[PDB]
């Protein structure tokens, strides 16, 4: 067997079309009355057969097995190919009318040939040189080789060549160039002149651009379906070919009979229009060929180009077999690299497994079970290639005749590798390989930590599941695409697979100050997390009743590597003095006395020493979508299996903590005392008074413009600054008064979910609403709503919502908030469309670039793009947050390893 090494593109010669054809088509009909194809028609059986029961006259194959064969239509008068129209015009105006030479000087000929031989690798230089030669020839009036006037050639839209000659003394006339004389002009062009025109002497010929024989695409390339009504629905190509044959027959009849030249020219133009619309219906400046219904026909050009065309719709991307799709549901109790597959999908989709020495018994059992029982099989393929569906009265015999070397398409079972994909597919983590785990109900299951790579949020999301079928594909998936890898994002060199909301909040509830757990809770959480353990550590405290209690830090430390040691400040740092004291203690010797650290322990300073958590609370900094310090260190220093084990264990542990400890959000989470409410009220009152003063100053001309903008823009910017500062101050008051024991605050300060802005808008004023960065202005003249005096520029009248969500919005504020939400929702779709187009452009530009074995990055033709990838040779996925190596981390780690 061979593989395609290269494809040379050329223009088919008339003799090539005549020889390649299996029939010459003469009759403009498709089928007879009885339903059989008309001999000599567009559906002649010598071009292949598509209707079942028919037989091909060229191959002898049935429908769906005959590939299809070409036919030709000997045109009575040659026509102009629309695709090569501009090329023909350029060649015509760059070559002589009588001899056909390029009308260039011999010295210019040799110099331009030498420059053509050079700079051929890149298309742009060759194109520019061709344009220069075209300009030089076009300007010239007399052919240097033979003395002859060269009348200028005008070109309208397609296939209209119109050169202008001086009919009389001082009077010029435009003479239309019929395809016959144009083609003859093109044949007179010599072969030594073609390269300077850009044409290939062998694979192309300018005369072949004027086509006198039209190839007819095979029947299999334009199938016709019989409707349930009993009528026949033909393809657009079939209709266009029928019209072309009819008009060609009319032209041939008028030519052999003899007709006035005007009628012949009209029929010739009709045939040319038919051919042009056949090749490209949406060609510039041509009436599209419309269907009988009224829609335009889809022709060859429409068959190729477009998002629904051949290239994008059936070559780059195409529908595949052995795929499944259903809604996804959460499942924290499966590993990060596993997926829950419904029994229906597992029974439907199959994995072809060739029976060998070791899996003979299992395949025999699953053949015995058959397509009904889940651990069964659907098909059995003998070594000869004959396939047999498993059914009753077959299971026993096929199980007996399994032997060795046969193929058995078995059901999905636990451990099988599949591709899981939620397909807005932006980065390479949108498809990862998961291990199959068969589940009862009919929905896909996904671990929560793997949501961030897929951007899935269990609100109706659906994901596609593809089953690789060849052993090479299965190995490729299981080695390169498994979910254990890709924990670190290639984008920023940080953890993308980590805890999201409940893991972070439960970790904080676990490791925070004063959080203790009873013996039963500790044993249950350790068993739930999957941590292997045969003895509990010594308890930290003792209850008033003498019951032993464990600290959350000890429980968390039970699942850390015994060598890990790191310190950092997380988001819970509100008093930097305590963090500075801890850092000062650490810097003196790098191995502080554990009790001394426990004396100065703080929630805002995480300090792990030999795998024991001595200070700090679990935050988004421990593990998260970005900046997971502990997870990054575990995945970079201990491997990728250890990272997966730690991730699974910590997710289950935190889930147990948050479930059995209680985590809720109520109305009281947005409550503020009377003092905080009064402070916020005074904040808004002062802001409104300041805005009023600014407005009054601007009305009296008292205010003067800021640099770079006018008076109106100065006033607008000052007002927005004042309003934003007022919102910030009210949010600061709310932050001061709400406290850290509020669950809504807890999940916001720890990064689990929500920002400070949400709490500010929910417990204090909503703040100023804006569209496109400006204050609300769209509405009536001088106002937004008809409930405000025209010409009002005040805070409330322009979108400043003074109410919280808890306090409820007034109707005006409700409309203003609706405007803000509308602008956001409108922004989303435009942004996603623009980003998608830009990503497509970037991918199509940078697809093939790769790192060679010498370390360089090279273009497909061998051009060196980078002599060392990233200018240092480090992959961003393997880098330390963009750094080549974390020097300080390595130094501290080694010093603690040896001196410890």
């Amino acid at each position: 067997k061979k593989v395609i090494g290269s494809i040379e593109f050329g223009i088919l010669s008339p003799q090539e079309i005549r020889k390649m054809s299996a029939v010459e088509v003469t009759v403009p009909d498709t089928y007879d009355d009885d339903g059989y194809p008309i001999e000599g028609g567009v559906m002649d059986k010598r071009m292949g057969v598509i209707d079942p029961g028919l037989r091909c006259e060229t191959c002898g194959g049935r429908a769906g097995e005959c590939p299809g064969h070409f036919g030709h239509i000997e045109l009575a008068r040659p026509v102009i190919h629309v695709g090569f129209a501009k090329t023909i015009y350029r060649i015509l105006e760059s070559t002589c009318r009588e001899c056909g030479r390029i009308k260039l000087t011999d010295e210019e000929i040799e110099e331009y040939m030498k420059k053509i031989e050079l700079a051929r690798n890149r298309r742009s230089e060759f194109n520019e040189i061709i344009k220069e030669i075209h300009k030089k020839a076009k300007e010239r009036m007399v052919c240097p080789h033979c003395g002859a006037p060269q009348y200028p050639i005008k070109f309208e839209k397609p296939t209209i060549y119109w050169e202008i000659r001086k009919d009389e003394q001082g009077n010029e006339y435009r003479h239309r160039l019929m395809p016959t004389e144009v083609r003859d002009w093109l044949e007179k062009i010599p072969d030594k002149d073609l390269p300077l025109l850009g044409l290939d002497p062998e694979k192309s010929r300018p005369e072949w651009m004027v086509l006198t024989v039209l190839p007819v695409p095979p029947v299999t390339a334009r199938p016709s379906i019989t409707l349930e009504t009993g009528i026949r629905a033909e393809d657009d190509l079939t209709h266009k070919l029928v019209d072309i044959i009819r008009i060609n027959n009319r032209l041939k009849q008028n030519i052999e009979a003899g007709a006035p030249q005007l009628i012949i020219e009209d029929l010739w133009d009709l045939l040319q229009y038919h051919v042009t619309t056949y090749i490209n219906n949406e060609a510039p400046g041509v009436p599209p060929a419309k269907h009988k219904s009224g829609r335009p026909l889809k022709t060859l050009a429409q068959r190729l180009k477009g998002k629904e065309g051949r290239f994008r719709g059936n070559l780059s991307g195409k529908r595949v077999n052995f795929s499944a799709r259903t809604v996804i549901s959460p499942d924290p109790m499966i590993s990060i690299n596993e997926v829950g597959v419904p029994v229906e999908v597992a029974m439907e989709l199959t994995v072809p497994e060739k029976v060998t020495e070791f899996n003979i018994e299992r395949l025999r059992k699953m053949v015995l079970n058959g397509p009904d029982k889940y651990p069964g099989a659907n098909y059995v393929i003998d070594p000869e290639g004959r396939r047999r569906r498993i059914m009753d009265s077959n299971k026993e015999t096929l199980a007996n005749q399994l032997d060795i070397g046969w193929t058995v398409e078995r059901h999905l079972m636990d451990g099988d590798i599949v591709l899981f994909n939620r397909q807005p597919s932006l980065h390479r983590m949108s498809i990862m390989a998961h291990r199959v785990r068969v589940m009862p109900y009919r929905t896909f299951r996904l671990n929560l930590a793997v949501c961030p790579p897929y951007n899935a949020d269990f609100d109706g999301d659906e994901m596609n599941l593809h089953v690789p079928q060849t052993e090479e594909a299965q190995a490729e998936a299981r080695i390169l695409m498994e979910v254990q890898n890709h924990i670190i994002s290639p984008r920023y060199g940080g953890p993308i697979i980590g805890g999201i909301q409940d893991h972070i909040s439960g970790g904080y509830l676990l490791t925070r100050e004063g959080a203790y757990f009873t013996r039963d809770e500790v044993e249950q959480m350790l068993m739930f997390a999957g941590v292997d353990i045969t003895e509990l550590p010594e308890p930290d405290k003792y209850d008033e009743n003498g019951n032993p209690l464990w600290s959350g830090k000890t429980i968390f430390s039970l699942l850390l590597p015994e060598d890990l040691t790191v310190w950092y400040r997380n988001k819970l740092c509100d008093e930097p003095e305590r963090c500075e004291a801890l850092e000062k203690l650490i810097e003196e010797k790098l191995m502080p006395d554990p009790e001394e650290v426990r004396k100065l322990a703080y929630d805002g300073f995480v300090y792990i020493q030999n795998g024991k958590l001595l200070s700090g609370a679990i935050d988004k900094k421990a593990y998260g979508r970005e900046d997971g310090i502990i997870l990054d260190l575990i995945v970079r220093e201990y491997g990728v299996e250890r990272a997966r084990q730690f991730l699974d264990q910590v997710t289950k542990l935190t889930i147990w903590v948050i479930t059995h400890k209680g985590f809720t959000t109520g109305i009281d989470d947005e409550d503020l005392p009377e003092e905080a409410r009064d402070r916020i009220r005074e904040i808004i009152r002062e802001a409104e008074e300041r805005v009023n003063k600014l407005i009054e100053a601007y009305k009296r001309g008292e205010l003067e413009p800021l640099p770079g903008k006018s008076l109106e823009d100065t006033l607008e910017s000052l007002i927005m600054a004042v309003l934003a500062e007022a919102r910030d101050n009210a949010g600061a008051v709310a932050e001061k008064y709400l406290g850290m024991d509020n669950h809504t605050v807890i999940m916001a300060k720890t990064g689990a979910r929500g920002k400070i802005l949400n709490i500010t808008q929910m417990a204090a004023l909503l703040g100023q609403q804006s569209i496109r960065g400006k204050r609300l202005y769209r509405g009536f003249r001088g106002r937004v709503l008809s409930h405000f005096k025209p010409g009002d520029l005040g805070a409330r009248a322009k979108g400043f919502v003074v109410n919280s969500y808890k306090s409820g919005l007034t109707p005006q504020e409700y409309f203003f908030h609706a405007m803000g939400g509308r602008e956001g929702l409108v922004d989303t779709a435009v942004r996603t469309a623009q980003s998608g187009y830009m990503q497509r452009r970037l991918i199509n530009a940078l697809q093939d670039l790769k790192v060679e074995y010498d370390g360089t990055v090279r273009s497909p033709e061998g051009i060196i793009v980078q002599f060392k990838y990233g200018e240092d040779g480090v992959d961003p996925m393997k880098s330390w947050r963009g750094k080549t190596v974390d020097v300080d981390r390595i130094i501290v780690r080694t010093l603690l390893k040896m001196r410890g």
Binding site: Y441, R442, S505, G779, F780, H817
Partner: protein, 1098 residues
């Protein structure tokens, strides 16, 4: 004063008197009463090529809904039979013909010109003015509001189109050439003309005409329209000295080149290129009379008024150039008029009637020529009757309604009515769409405008491409129906307005515009406006009239057109609203109606133009002497699905939008008629419930009679991480007791089609000798007649209507109807009937019981969507110290990021309502305050915060934190996981590309697009890409001639492989490539391109 609770009574009376679909019914009733006759009056009598014969048109009459039987006669037809027998609910249309023989008119003849489809509940339908029992006896839901059509058995609703106001000129800046552009959309007989004037950066004035290929200097058009004198032109355009100078400068260079008589010829050169001077003149005057300002007229007498209107437009563009006026906003609702069912039907009927008129002309001429004058004049009645051919008009109209493609570029005008539930149907009947393309980023058109207040719902709009471009009407919105303009013009002229012919406009004189065209001039325009509104309030002037003025530019606008969205307001005079307590009591006692209040001048209807002059108060205690109007009910500014949301002002706007959009997808008893209705798909919640916290608008509308959803006991806590990421945890015991249970209905249809030549198909159990015979097990439930017995369990791929068709293979083929491969159920109903043509038709309805499972989507009214992540037994659910077990658990992490305080307030209100035994009012702005609810919850014996002490079901100890628990109204959406799961090992393929088919309904394969290709490439997986894109879609083998590179031919008959192009037999080898690439090679070998292939040894 009057409490808002007292204005609620008036608003409820408004909704009681006029339904929710009054726009469709009003427009269609106006169309039937006057529109059809108006169109027929535009279409003058047919004049054929007969020496002394032509027919005039009499009076259009529409009869009762009747259907002509194929072998019987016109029986009466009712909508249920029209939508069951796959008929079109239409009525005969009759037109009188007046034959004019040699200038004299004979007796009229009434001939049926076609059938006109009838909108339900309109003044011609058979359901009009029928009591509830009468509608029930006809197999109809009395709650159904009508307003839609039945076309070929399917319910079609015409969605209003938000077009730009016709005949109104708008000024704006191009910002590219510093050219001020002023365009007008002139309408006449369904044809729009885009006449625009232009002041370019050179200071010269240009005019654009749609059929003139190039712009023309303005003064040339002005002189072509009959303005001979230069000074007359300068005076007509404007009298302000600066404008006078601009016109003098613009006119000197025009008069120095083109005079009055030369302008028509100059336009003719561009319009009709060539040497035919008379033809150029004819084309120029044609495009002047028809294609420039058609709304003014098409007669040469209307040329001068075209000149005045063009001068006014030029004056406006000059004023924009001088900056004396602001840019005209295109999203301002003073500039947009809706197109309703009446006007769209008028245009469609105009097109169809033109087709019929031309056809009848052709038929008359042909018949007269091909039988002379023997009986054409001997009996003219038969000559007219036989030439009618009425099917053309009805086929055109029915096709347009069924496909939705209106004449012209309009598409999607008629849409399939949504019958998922009550809310979806009513919201579809109250929907507005924009004609702009959804792909482009129309930032200014997709945003909320201040003029939408009370006219368009601020929150209900779809997500994605249609956001902002698809709008739903506010509950207080009222859409006008046009009054005769001539009477309005006469009244305005009688008021003191002097036409511009006698008195020319001046800076100190008010310019009055009626319906967007300038009519005359008056002094003290404020007095004219005051007189107009006083007359309207006094009742002598119709409600539809609206008037506004502008002190900035001294212009008075009078509107009396159709398609204006308006809102009602209470007139406030001297700080005292017109509405009083005794009016409210009279309305409450039924002595006074809404139309009465409108007629007495108590309540006023204002569109955007008149509202611009208003200073509206929002609350009765906010009224001062400076206020002109008071808001009837600020909570009515929302749409209907948006009004379903309780406490909408405590939620973020995106979540309100999500809730409003998801309210239209819930399951419930949408219509009581569902049992006997034939519909492709439907759902039925087994136990719908009233929302405990509900708005009063929902009861006034009628949502309480057709509820969709249930009240759940919801606890907000994190439980085993199975409600993480917007997932929902639900109770198994609650499901087993009927919570969120539903049934899915599907109606399969099988027709006994009658082919040509008498070759019919037969309803029968086919013998195994027929071609395409399925398994004998699939016909298990069939009866000897050929139809499946009702109440028989049917699973996937089992047939319901055994059917065989005449052979067409190249024995009878099989075309029986079976259930869809992934659908099961029980056969609820089998009906047999007769089609329109007379063939037998059978509808089979299968019902499938859908008990909630993992993956089914649930939503609340506050936009909190989610799927069931786990189904937990009751003994595993936590319980409260009061014995309350949740029916549903939601993660607290979804609350703060979404900022839905309204959901928490609704939970508190639901608990309080359950404890009190009285439902809690959750209206938008007058509902029960959260403080009152918390105090009441405190007094009832529960914690005021709503948190309760809960115990863990698994371990038995109480949770450390107090858990927030309440009652929230959750609704089950129709996005069930059983309707979405799909898996394809291997199946059918497309004939053209040999690739797997597309769609869940036809064993389709999932598209592995190019984005996934790049994802696979970025992983380095090269063999996996091969396996996914080559082996599993279209792998094939081809024979390639190594000598030429073309595709070799294999002769299966002769057992030889060779290349016909070169005749090689030894240099032939197989290659492996996707069938799509071979097809690409075929399409490249077409259009004459040679893709020579080079082969390599591997």
């Amino acid at each position: 004063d009057v409490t808002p609770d007292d204005l609620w009574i008036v608003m409820e009376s408004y909704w009681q008197e006029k339904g929710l679909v009054r726009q469709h019914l009003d427009s269609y009733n106006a169309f039937i009463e006057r529109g059809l006759q108006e169109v027929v009056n535009e279409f003058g009598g047919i004049k054929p090529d007969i020496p002394d014969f032509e027919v005039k048109f009499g009076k259009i009459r529409v009869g009762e809904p009747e259907f002509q039987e194929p072998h019987g006669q016109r029986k009466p037809l009712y909508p249920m039979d029209a939508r069951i027998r796959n008929l079109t609910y239409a009525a005969p249309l009759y037109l009188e013909m007046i034959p004019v023989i040699k200038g004299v008119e004979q007796d009229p003849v009434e001939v049926r010109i076609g059938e006109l489809p009838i909108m339900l509940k309109s003044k011609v339908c058979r359901l009009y003015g029928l009591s509830d029992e009468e509608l029930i006896k006809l197999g109809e839901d009395p709650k159904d509001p009508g307003g839609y059509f039945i076309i070929n058995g399917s319910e079609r609703v015409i969605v209003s189109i938000e077009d730009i106001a016709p005949n109104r000129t708008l000024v704006e800046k191009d910002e590219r050439q510093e050219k001020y552009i002023a365009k007008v959309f002139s309408y006449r007989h369904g044809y729009r003309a885009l006449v625009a004037v232009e002041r370019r950066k050179d200071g010269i004035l240009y005019v654009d005409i749609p059929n003139v290929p190039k712009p023309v200097k303005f003064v040339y058009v002005m002189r072509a329209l009959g303005l001979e004198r230069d000074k007359d032109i300068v005076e007509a355009v404007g009298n302000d000295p600066e404008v006078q100078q601009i016109m003098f400068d613009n006119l000197e260079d025009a008069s120095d080149i083109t005079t009055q008589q030369e302008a028509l010829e100059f336009i003719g050169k561009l319009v009709a290129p060539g040497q035919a001077r008379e033809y150029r003149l004819k084309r120029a005057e044609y495009v002047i009379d028809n294609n420039l300002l058609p709304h003014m007229g098409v007669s040469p007498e209307d040329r001068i008024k075209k000149a005045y209107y063009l001068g006014m437009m030029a004056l406006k563009v000059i004023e924009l150039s001088l900056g004396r006026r602001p840019e005209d906003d295109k999203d301002h609702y003073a500039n947009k008029r809706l197109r309703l069912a009446g006007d769209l039907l008028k245009d469609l009927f105009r097109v169809a009637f033109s087709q019929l008129v031309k056809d009848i002309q052709y038929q008359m001429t042909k018949t007269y020529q091909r039988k002379g004058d023997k009986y054409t004049f001997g009996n003219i009645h038969r000559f007219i009757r036989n030439s009618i051919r009425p099917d053309v008009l009805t086929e055109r109209i029915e096709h347009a309604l069924a496909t939705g493609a209106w004449p012209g570029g309009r598409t999607g005008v008629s849409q399939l009515l949504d019958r998922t539930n009550y809310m979806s149907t009513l919201s579809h009947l109250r929907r507005v769409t924009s004609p702009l393309d959804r792909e482009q980023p129309h930032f200014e058109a997709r945003d909320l405008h201040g003029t939408h207040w009370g006219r368009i719902c601020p929150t209900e709009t779809p997500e994605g491409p249609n956001c902002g471009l698809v709008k739903n009407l506010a509950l207080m919105a009222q859409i006008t129906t046009a009054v005769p303009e001539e009477e309005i013009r006469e009244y305005l002229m009688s008021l003191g307005i002097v036409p511009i012919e006698v008195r020319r406009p001046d800076p100190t004189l008010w310019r009055v515009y009626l319906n967007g065209v300038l009519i005359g001039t008056i002094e003290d325009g404020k007095a004219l406006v005051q007189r107009i509104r006083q007359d309207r309030r006094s009742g002598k002037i119709s409600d539809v009239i609206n008037v506004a003025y502008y002190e900035d530019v001294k212009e008075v606008y009078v509107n009396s057109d159709d398609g204006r969205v308006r809102r009602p307001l209470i007139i406030v005079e001297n700080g005292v609203p017109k509405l009083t307590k005794e009016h409210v009591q009279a309305v409450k006692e039924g002595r006074l109606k809404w139309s009465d209040l409108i007629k007495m001048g108590i309540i006023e209807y204002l569109d955007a133009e008149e509202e611009e002059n208003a200073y509206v108060a929002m609350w009765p205690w906010e009224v001062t002497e400076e206020h002109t109007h008071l808001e009837l009910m600020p909570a009515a500014i929302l749409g209907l699905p948006a009004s379903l949301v309780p406490y909408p002002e405590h939620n973020a706007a995106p979540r309100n939008t999500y809730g409003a959009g998801m309210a239209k997808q819930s399951l419930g008893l949408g219509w009581a008629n569902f049992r006997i209705r034939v519909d492709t798909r439907g759902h039925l919640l087994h136990y719908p419930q009233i929302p405990l916290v509900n708005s009063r608008i929902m009861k006034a509308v009628g949502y309480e009679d057709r509820p969709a959803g249930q009240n759940f006991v919801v606890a907000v806590l994190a439980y085993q991480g199975y409600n993480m990421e917007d997932a929902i945890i639900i109770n198994k015991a609650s499901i087993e007791r009927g919570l969120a249970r539903s049934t899915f209905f599907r109606t399969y249809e099988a027709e006994e089609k009658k082919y040509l030549g008498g070759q019919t198909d037969k309803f029968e159990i086919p013998d195994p000798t027929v071609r395409g015979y399925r398994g004998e097990k699939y016909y298990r439930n069939l009866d000897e007649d050929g139809l499946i017995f009702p109440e028989s369990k049917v699973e996937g791929k089992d047939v319901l209507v055994g059917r065989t068709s005449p052979p067409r293979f190249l024995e009878r083929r099989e075309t029986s109807v079976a259930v869809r491969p992934s659908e099961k159920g029980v056969v609820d109903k089998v009906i047999i009937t007769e089609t329109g043509d007379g063939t037998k038709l059978v509808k089979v309805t299968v019902r499938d019981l859908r008990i909630p499972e993992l993956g089914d989507k649930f939503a609340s009214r506050h936009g909190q969507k989610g799927v069931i992540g786990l189904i937990v037994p009751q003994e595993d659910m936590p319980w409260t110290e009061s014995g309350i077990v949740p029916d549903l658990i939601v993660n607290p992490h979804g609350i703060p990021s979404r900022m839905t305080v309204g959901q928490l307030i609704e939970a508190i209100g639901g608990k309080v309502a359950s404890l009190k035994g009285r439902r809690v009012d959750g209206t938008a702005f007058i509902g029960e305050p959260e403080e009152k609810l918390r105090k009441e919850l405190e007094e009832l014996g529960f914690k005021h915060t709503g948190r309760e002490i809960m115990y863990d079901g698994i371990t038995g100890k109480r949770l450390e934190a107090d858990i927030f628990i309440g009652v929230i109204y959750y609704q089950r959406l129709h996005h069930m996981v059983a309707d979405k799961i799909h898996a394809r090992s291997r199946g059918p393929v497309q004939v053209l590309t040999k690739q797997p088919t597309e769609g869940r309904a036809r064993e389709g394969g999932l598209r592995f697009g190019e984005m996934e290709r790049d994802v696979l490439v970025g992983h380095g997986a090269a063999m996996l890409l091969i396996e996914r894109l080559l082996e599993e879609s279209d792998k094939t083998e081809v024979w390639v001639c190594e000598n030429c590179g073309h595709i070799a031919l294999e002769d299966k008959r002769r057992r030889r492989v060779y290349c016909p192009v070169c005749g090689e037999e030894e240099r032939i080898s197989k290659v492996e490539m996707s069938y799509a690439f071979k097809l690409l090679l075929d399409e490249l070998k077409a259009m004459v391109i040679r893709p020579k292939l080079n082969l390599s040894e591997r």
